[PDB]
Design a protein around this nucleic acid. Structure first.
Ligand code: MG
Ligand code: MG
Ligand code: MG
Ligand code: MG
Ligand code: MG
Ligand code: MG
Ligand code: MG
Ligand code: MG
Ligand code: MG
Ligand code: MG
Ligand code: MG
Ligand code: MG
Ligand code: MG
Ligand code: MG
Lengths: 129, 88, 51, 55, 100
RNA sequence: GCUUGAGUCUCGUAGAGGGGGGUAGAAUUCCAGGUGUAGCGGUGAAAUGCGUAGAGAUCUGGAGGAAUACCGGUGGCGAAGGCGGCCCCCUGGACGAAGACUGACGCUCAGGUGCGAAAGCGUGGGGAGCAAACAGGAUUAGAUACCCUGGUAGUCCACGCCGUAAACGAUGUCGACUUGGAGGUUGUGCCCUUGAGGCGUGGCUUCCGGAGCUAACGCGUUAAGUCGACCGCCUGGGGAGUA
């Protein structure tokens, strides 16, 4: 039933945001981390944090610009029921360029801006603008 | 619903030490034991349709747990059903 | 139900009857059985008696 | 409440008629109003309390 | 081994048999190594309503710990026996003493 | 391999949860009798009906079946159906408090299987009250009705059928996330127990209400909000859930 963690991230964010909430936690995983990275690196959140050894624990700091939140929309795109894989020439570009799409390639979890540069493709995890 | 006395005795009989309560092999035997008991309950009555739901449940469980063990250690499995006496 | 009411007073003084029987359980049982509709009937004795 | 043999404590939870008294009158808690009934019923069956002012 | 409250009411005329009965039911229960935590020969008490015609009747409270088996035969002998006009074996939840 | 998902173990708690056996009081009808005497009953008004073989009314003693007043409650329990006197026996689930075991053993589920109100069917039984059918009396233009006097199946038990209901929250199951307020219910930790309590921390529930959602009504931490997994189903009305 907890069969898609990444959606739970995308949503713990989405919600916590719409609830003008500063913090947010969840059980972690290499895959969660690699994404939190891109979210920080590309600057949709302040910074993350994983506190624990036995039962690791992602922690994310939400950014807020003006009154609004920085993440205007965080949406799953691949998923257990139906998985997605675009090549390189067919990778998606969110909001015409603004905002971005997380994508896991054989050379790690990057953005579409990235993968395009890397010259390769992968599984488009989610969209974020 | 199956005396502490008896319930304990089986944990004692199927797992490592007592305390090894949740060992696969042990649950299966703990269920088995209740199921077989229950037969006499439903012998009389038979109309006790509600209680019956719990018993079927009992079996759905064991069945599931028994399949898991098989996938793990088919040795611990074979030993087990001989020992309890089921599958025919 | 019962009133001793000893010496001085010819006034009935049985207001106790408006404390249980009479149109109490007696208007109740008088007629249409009911059966599950009282459920609905009493679901207004509370949809009201909330305020 | 605690017991049906307590026809003493019990007798102030019924009307002259013998009918159990609603909880909305007695201010009694919930859990206990049941204990109370179930012990008035016991009292009644053991001819320890009338069902009825008819006796 | 389960406890029970247990109380029966013997017909007045047959009052004189109440002793022999208690004596008996006890030897019966203790017989199967069961304790006898309370006993109270309330004697002739007056009734709330008349029952079987006749008012007043000989009561006997009596808490016990004994197997769900002697409890059985008790409940029936209370039927077999016309002198007892009521009985009622009850709850349990550990022994009791004194009350009343 | 891991321990948090899921299981197992200890102790308890609440409960119209289920199956079986006993048993209680009140009422109705009936049988027998005491007293009593010309009406009772029923309606909107009436009549059919009942009563001088003594009715109704009152008292007493019985017989029998059916349901369990008060408690009783936006109370509780169960997967749904649905489950209310009391007691014992047998039994299912739920919950909570400690820690201890198992180590992903899970979620969902076409097909399949089981369950499944009332009516209805088969066999024996049982039959007080109620009551399709039917009969009589009224109303009415008519009255195959609604009202009245009767009353059979049925309603009750056993066993076996049927498998349907506006079987509804008209809202599939599971999981995660998201401001509040006032209750009801039921566990459990702590506090001069010094209050009939004081602050916590679970499960369940009722009423309001915020974002959000909605065609709107409305829903709103028990979502109709934000998300995922799986299943069922919809594709204009009629025809037809018919051939
Ligand atoms: Mg994974
Ligand atoms: Mg009678
Ligand atoms: Mg009579
Ligand atoms: Mg239980
Ligand atoms: Mg069936
Ligand atoms: Mg039927
Ligand atoms: Mg029949
Ligand atoms: Mg009629
Ligand atoms: Mg249908
Ligand atoms: Mg409904
Ligand atoms: Mg609230
Ligand atoms: Mg609302
Ligand atoms: Mg939803
Ligand atoms: Mg058809």
């Amino acid at each position: 039933s907890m069969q898609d963690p990444i959606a739970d991230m995308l949503t713990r964010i989405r919600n916590g945001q719409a609830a003008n909430k500063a913090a947010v936690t969840m059980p972690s995983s290499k895959l969660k981390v690699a994404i939190a990275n891109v979210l920080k690196e590309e600057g949709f959140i302040e910074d993350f944090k994983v506190e624990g050894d036995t039962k690791p624990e992602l922690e994310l700091t939400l950014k807020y610009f003006q009154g609004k939140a920085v993440v205007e929309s965080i949406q799953r795109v691949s998923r257990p029921g139906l998985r997605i894989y675009k090549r390189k020439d067919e990778l998606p570009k969110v909001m015409a360029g603004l905002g971005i799409a997380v994508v896991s390639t054989s050379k790690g979890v990057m953005t579409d801006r990235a993968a395009r540069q890397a010259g390769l493709g992968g599984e488009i995890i989610c969209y974020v603008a | 619903s199956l005396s502490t006395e008896a319930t304990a005795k089986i944990v004692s009989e199927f797992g490592r030490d007592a305390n090894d309560t949740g060992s696969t092999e042990v649950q299966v035997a703990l269920l088995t034991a209740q199921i077989n008991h229950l037969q006499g309950h439903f012998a009389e009555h038979k109309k006790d349709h509600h209680s019956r739901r719990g018993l079927l449940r009992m079996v759905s469980q064991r069945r599931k747990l028994l399949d898991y063990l098989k996938r793990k250690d088919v040795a611990r499995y074979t030993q087990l059903i001989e020992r309890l006496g089921l599958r025919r | 139900i019962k009133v001793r009411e000893n010496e001085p007073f010819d006034v009935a003084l049985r207001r106790f009857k408006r404390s249980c029987e009479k149109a109490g359980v007696l208007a109740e049982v008088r007629r249409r059985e009911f059966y599950e509709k009282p459920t609905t009937e009493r679901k207004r004795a509370k949809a009201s008696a909330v305020k | 409440e605690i017991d049906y043999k307590d026809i003493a404590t019990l007798k102030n939870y019924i009307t002259e008629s013998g009918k159990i008294v609603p909880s909305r009158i007695t201010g009694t808690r919930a859990k206990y109003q049941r204990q109370l009934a179930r012990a008035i019923k016991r009292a009644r069956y053991l001819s320890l309390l009338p069902y009825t002012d008819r006796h | 081994m389960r406890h029970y409250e247990i109380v029966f009411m013997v017909h007045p005329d047959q009052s004189e048999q109440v002793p022999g009965m208690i004596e008996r039911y006890t030897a019966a229960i203790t017989g199967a190594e069961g304790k006898i935590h309370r006993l109270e020969d309330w004697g002739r008490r007056q009734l709330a309503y008349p029952i079987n015609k006749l008012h007043k009747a000989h009561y006997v409270l009596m808490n016990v710990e004994a197997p769900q088996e002697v409890i059985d035969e008790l409940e029936t002998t209370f039927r077999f026996n016309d002198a007892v006009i009521r009985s009622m074996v009850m709850r349990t939840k550990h022994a009791v003493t004194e009350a009343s």
